[PDB]
């Protein structure tokens, strides 16, 4: 079908809802979940550092991502964004049909 | 034109600044949408007050996020009367309207609509 | 027309909310009258302060009692700084007038007549 | 394999243990996790709105994807689930194997 | 004419009534500079809030001291949002003006100015 | 590509670090991320019981996984480790360049 | 038949609704599995205790999720020995049966174990 | 015979101990009255608790009031889960009756129809 | 047979874990002679409660020293109305038995005579 | 050999046990690397201090996650200036070299670089 | 010769100066045994800590009973992390040997042994 | 060479930062004087101490004002025992001497005087 749940890491909530509120407001996605209170463990430059970040879970689809992408590259504080597509391999029908009516 | 105040109230969950600042937004855009204002130039002021309980963020913030930000934005907190609706958000604000008293529209939302004045 | 604000302030012995209710029909009524104003229709909003030991009533909802139910009203709770007089009601409203700034009457009621900027 | 983890987006936590208690009970579930303290925003009608939610992270398989459905529409308080599958490309055997002896 | 917001800020670095009223007079005639008013008639309100941790004074006092006797004084309490920069005074005031609102100019000093929404 | 997100279930703070530290140190992982919190209800040996438990996810890339594996089960306290990957369909381009530099 | 008391505890790790609804669950079904309790009809009563430590759930709301509709459920707030254990869920219910004091069961999970009378 | 728990809920406005003890009675002759219980030779006793916020009085003292001196009588305070109802007095009968489960009659009066289990 | 709930209090002069556990000791067993009671077969439960004064030890344990091991026993902490006896242990006991309501007895101990029933 | 002082900071932005922890290993980490210490046989102790905002954990535990098992540790609470960075893990550590003093490299990670000693 | 710390750790049972001091002592004396140390003139010195439910007496008199009049003796409190174990005196000694740090052995009494890293 | 610790104290009069500071600043060098330190290079560490009264200034700031840049400074809050001196600051310095124990100067001043250890 397409459809897709995208994880992208954010460092704050203000970045989090204004992520988040764009995708919604702009039709590159029907379901945007917040998840708060992440510890991030990462490789930065030579060594290994942690940060905060929270977590958001965009309910999309595949032919909207390139568009996503874009905007979230825009949005997001980053030379690097954290955005990765996990593909949904099946779900309720209601759901999916509805994801699809207010995406795009 | 003249002035006239725009009211509205949404009530969150729990005081998390995600919900706080996605919440400011939906009511700051209903409330916009209600009246017909498509710019942010017909406002004066907008005023945000809170309950007690809500300290992780400030809604005022949220205004900048929906791009108000050359509307003077101040907020305040509000008086504890035991038994008032908990988690609250209000927002007045001042627009420069010719718009009669009473067209103009007043939102409510979640659990604010039980203190709308109707 | 331009907006003038409106001043006024009135104390309260006890912390009831009959008196606290009571306390802002007075004020707000009297203050209408000291300005001739003879509908709500020309106020863009009210809002109300109250010091920190009046919290058993909303002095908002006495405002729906004189019939002010189409002008926004928001309130906030005041700075309690130390030897202010105790249990005070006071009130701003903005008045959609082509009055004068000193042709504006305020109004001071009960142990309020003190801090009348007199 | 077919195993796969399912996203279900629930209201409260009456609600995500109920649904949660059930699956496992029932055998339509290996194993629930519940992820507490959501932001969600969402189009709704005509426009972008917020509510709370938690989230249910179900470790199932396909073949009992759906009797899932049906059980999860039962319990669950809305027109429309959010349920959605996301497969298992690999996992630790001992736990695959696991998941399938307790799952159906 | 119609209504503009004016928004300022100040810091400072204790309690104490004269720091208070200092800076509220620093703040409040700046912003009037800024603005050009060489009047109070102009002003429909001023609204003053402060930090929590702001108790020894009223900064509404102190625009008696630089003559604002009619112009209206609201004062309330903000919200105390941790992390958020301490001994704030903030000011709001409402201005009648025909200046377009993206050439009202907002004042932060101090501190303030890391608030300042730039 | 073969980029992965493996989830990882763990029982408290000390081995959540413990093995995210690790799994980055060690280049089995670019990043790792951190949500506390869950609830856990699962089927073990014949009924229903809770449990606390945090999640990790870990991103790092289908040929690191086998070590990943490994590594995992000699840290985590338990004799069958919650260790699963889902796959990703796509993303930035650059982050996901990113996740192969550092993994590996 | 006469009454027998059933008791059991369990702990949790943190004050969370779910986990104190998923706790309270888990040790009211071992309880009547324990006893070979296949109705609710057979209950007389129900009453939960927890520490003071869990105030973000009711224990009696999880019973109601696995059909204890008619069983009457109630529950109060243990006293806070220092030195007790912490987070503390415990059900006492109270069974209608012909079975002998010495033959009911009682059940002690997580760290609830080291306070089983034994 | 076997035993039944009977329950029932009240709330009261404020916290007087003429408001509870006249609560108090109300309840307890409602669910005496809803369950035919024309004597107290049949309760093998009554546990009351109550919210935190009611203090001035032990309703157990209306009990006598009604003539139950020979039915033992417990009481506890609650478990103060934020969000739950104020001002709630709650009552547990244990009645030596040879009723079903499921034709004990339970009571919920004034604002504790919304906590019933329906 | 039936069930009827016994009833006894005591007080103690101090929160000491002696003093708590030996009041326990003799007001459990003054019940159990006044009842006639010479085996804990006959007890459905027994549930303690004890004033917010006394939090150094968990009567319930004292149970255990005269060898209630197998008796349910629950406790809850009682409500703080001023002015009521302090330092009070309260015990209800649930007794599987054929004794008429009017035959059992209660046992009021200490300063715990003046809240007896009489 | 003799003794030499290696000290450092780092900052969190919660009281997360998770973030404690992964703080505290980066910090002793990053201060070992600077200082080339292939051992924990060089120090002779390491002493944690943290500010009074972060309780959820001990950073002594994370040192254990990264081996150092022989090496002494003790903890203590800093004094609560007003003003401070919020949130600080401090660590001295008592190094057994050659080192001149000021060849030693300290080392201040997130926030704490504004109280670097430069 | 280099510096090695010594760890140990001791509980009590309550917070009486005469149990702080003697457990102080047994601690003390038994480190000092433990790594074979014939005198104070080889300790550079030691820190002690306690929990924040010691408050009585400071273990760091304990040591000139036992005549560590020369060692010089600072003392900090710890940080109160929930769950952590309650009333522990830990103590760090500095040693000026040439021990190896895997050759040092640490001490942990009475309900210490369960924070003991092994 | 080896390390012995070197002890002093000062009592301020007030938790002013100017009386912090000049006090430490008094205490550093004299002790520094005492036993002949020419140079900080010999300085291991300080760590300094204080009351629960004194939070208006780290003493550790002064330590930089006499040129302490290169010395690792750390510091924690001291255990309130009732009966204490009140307003102490308390130092312990690390020295990287060959002076024997006894050799090394304590320095007491003010009111500390009283807490020497002679």
């Known amino acids: ?104 | 034109g003249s002035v006239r105040g725009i009211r509205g109230a949404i009530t969150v969950e729990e005081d998390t600044p995600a919900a706080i600042l996605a919440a400011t937004i939906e009511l700051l855009l209903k409330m916009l949408e209600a009246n017909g204002i498509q710019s942010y130039e017909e406002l004066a002021a907008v005023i945000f007050t809170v309950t007690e309980d809500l300290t992780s963020a400030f809604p005022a913030e949220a205004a900048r996020l929906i791009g108000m930000h050359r509307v003077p934005l101040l907020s305040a907190r509000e008086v504890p009367v035991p038994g008032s609706l908990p988690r609250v958000i209000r927002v007045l604000a001042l627009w420069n309207t010719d718009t009669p008293q009473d067209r103009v529209r007043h939102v409510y939302l979640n659990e604010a609509v039980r203190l709308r004045p109707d």
Chains 1, 4, 6 share one sequence.
Do not use: Q
């Open chain 1, 1 to 104: 079908g397409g459809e897709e749940v995208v994880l992208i890491t954010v460092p704050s909530a203000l970045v989090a809802v204004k992520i988040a509120h764009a995708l919604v407001e702009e039709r590159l996605a029907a379901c945007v979940n917040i998840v708060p209170g992440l510890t991030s463990i990462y490789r930065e430059e030579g060594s290994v550092v942690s940060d905060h970040e929270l977590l958001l879970l965009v309910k999309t689809t595949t032919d909207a991502f390139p568009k996503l992408k874009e905007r979230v590259k825009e949005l997001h504080p980053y030379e690097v964004p954290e955005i990765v597509a996990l593909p949904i391999a099946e779900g309720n029908r209601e759901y999916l049909d509805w994801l699809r009516e207010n995406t795009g």
